[PDB]
């Protein structure tokens, strides 16, 4: 039987669902919790193989989508709310400044919670803050630091790209 792997949205404006082969032509159909009309996937191309892409014309944050994959033998119907499947982009504008002496870490978003880490890494949940203080670090060492973010009800974004700084000798 075919199974729905996962659906994801990068900005609540469009989304994509991926699937896995049942054992054959694969098609994807859906409907909205609201009405009784059925629809077919609007695009099997822009998202690569085995996927369905929903552009702005077919994306709504006001209704639940009931998605199911077919093989010619349906799959288990899946319920999707575009606002709960958001997986953002790493935070941006990461700046590091030395200030007895602590490291002032600062970023900007791409509300959301955040997480910074610095080296097997020392994770720091920061909540809704967009700036963070770190004390008692080793003098004379280059430090690696990254960030992550997550929506109110989403998935974590990948880790940002490394930034370095050096603690005074």
């Amino acid at each position: 039987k075919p199974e729905i792997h996962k659906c994801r949205s990068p900005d609540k404006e469009t989304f994509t669902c991926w699937w896995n082969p049942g054992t054959t032509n694969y098609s994807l159909t859906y409907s909205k919790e609201g009405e009784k009309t059925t629809y077919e996937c609007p695009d099997y191309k822009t998202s690569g193989p085995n996927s369905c892409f929903f552009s702005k014309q077919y994306t709504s944050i006001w209704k639940i989508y009931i998605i199911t994959v077919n093989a010619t033998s349906s799959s288990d119907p899946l319920y999707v709310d575009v606002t709960y499947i958001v997986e953002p982009e790493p935070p941006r504008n990461l700046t590091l400044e030395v200030k007895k002496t602590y490291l002032w870490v600062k970023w900007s978003p791409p509300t959301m919670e955040y997480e910074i880490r610095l080296k097997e890494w020392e994770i720091h949940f920061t909540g809704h803050q967009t700036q963070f203080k770190v004390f008692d670090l080793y003098p004379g060492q280059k430090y690696l630091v990254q960030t992550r973010c997550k929506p109110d009800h989403g998935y974590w974004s990948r880790w940002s790209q490394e930034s370095s700084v050096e603690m005074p000798n």
Binding site: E33, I61, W62, I64, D76, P77, Y79, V80, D81, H153
Partner: protein
Amino acid sequence: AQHPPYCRNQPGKCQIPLQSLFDRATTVANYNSKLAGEMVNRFDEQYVINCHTSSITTPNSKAEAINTEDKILFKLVISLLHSWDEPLHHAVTELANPALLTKAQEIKEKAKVLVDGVEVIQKRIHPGEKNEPYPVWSEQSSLTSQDENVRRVAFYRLFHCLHRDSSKIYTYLRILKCRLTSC
């Protein structure tokens, strides 16, 4: 097989709760209101309003707004939003020939996203309501006038009225949310 978090509740069905719907509507409305304020500013730092929506009568004091029946608040929000799609269309065409152009395109797109939600909420609480005709700005051709001055005043009226109506839409949605669910 999987479902959204909240469908983790008894009712055999699985619809988005009314609380979640009102949350999304008020945050989209809050966003349009910020954008409109930004356009108002940028325009005043570079260059009497008689808004075409003034014909739609609205409660303008707290006493009166709080007293308004929910059926009428919905109607007022839906026709105010419908009324701005044409004027924005004309503005965007003119500015297309900096920043103004970009925010104008965004507010026009989000206003359409927002009316969609307001109709869904309205049909959920009051099945079979129908929305009536809404006003038009006939003088909207002035946004493209060859005369520089008449053109500047056209945009002035446009951004300030856009700012006032974003603000009413957002206040009326907050009143309904506090009354029909949780503030």
